[PDB]
Structure 1
Amino acid sequence: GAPATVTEQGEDITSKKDRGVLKIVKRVGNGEETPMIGDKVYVHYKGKLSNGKKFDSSHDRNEPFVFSLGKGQVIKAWDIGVATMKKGEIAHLLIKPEYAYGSAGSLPKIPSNATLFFEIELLDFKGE
């Protein structure tokens, strides 16, 4: 499936090169610019435990998911991964627990030491 394809072909976009955030571009975006820290960012996404026990999607709430890049609001893996994307890109991320919810987890929704998978579409981003 898509997660395994990321393991196999995904680029390691971590600074430590620890495979903690792996990325495959699934549909290329438009123009050169990528978001900067502080930018207000608009996305659609589908996320699941890589074990498929829990799923989530912006679509379930009927509207884009909006957050400020680099600004405390999402797991580390998203701050890292969404920063690499272009307006209109869709990407897959596979995420080790250190870059998501760690040994602590976020019980009962997210277990300890959980690996996460997302599909993300960057819809837009605007400066603060």
Structure 2
Amino acid sequence: GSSGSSGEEWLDILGNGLLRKKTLVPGPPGSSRPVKGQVVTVHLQTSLENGTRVQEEPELVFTLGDCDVIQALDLSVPLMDVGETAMVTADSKYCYGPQGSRSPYIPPHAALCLEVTLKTAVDRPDLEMSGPSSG
């Protein structure tokens, strides 16, 4: 027969298998998934499949719904409730690309372990005296 939710292994966000998600720590019953188009602040940490931390962003902020961040992070944020620590493992393609990065630099086709943590989601900006400009 069939029980219902079949989650023996990581969760397929896209379905292919590249970009996956693993809830490390679930949030409270009061929390809930944020909205696309608001200021979401989480903690993303890039690390080589081996264990070579490439970067560490404690206060990562971006505008959900604008792909202003990694394709494995912006596609996971809206897949986790505020206060729930979830990890994501996608191929470089979704991370930086088959071409690599600049600074920090990263090798192509080189998967990277990223740990997403939804802290708070609001409309108001977090980083004062900061923002994009025309030029």
TM-score by length of 2: 0.74
Match of 1:81? 76
Other structure's SS at 1:18 match: coil
**In structure 2, what is the Cα distance between the partners aligned to 1:72 and 1:9?**
27
The amino acid of 1:70's aligned partner reads G
Match of 2:32? 33
Which has the greater radius of gyration? 2
Other structure's SS at 2:72 match: helix
Q: Larger RCO: Structure 1 or Structure 2 (Cα < 8 Å, ≥ 6 residues apart)? A: 1
**In structure 2, what is the Cα distance between the partners aligned to 1:98 and 1:41?**
23
- Following superposition, the deviation at residue 73 of structure 1 comes to 1.2
Other structure's SS at 1:58 match: strand
Match of 2:66 among 62, 66, 71: 71
Match of 2:12? 12
Superposed CA RMSD in Å reads 2.0
Other structure's SS at 1:56 match: strand
Compare 25-34 and 117-126 and name the one that shifted more: 25-34
TM-score by length of 1: 0.78
% identical aligned pairs: 33
Structure ranking higher in helix proportion: 1
Match of 1:3? none
Structure 1: 5+ residue runs without aligned partners? 1-7
Match of 2:46? 47
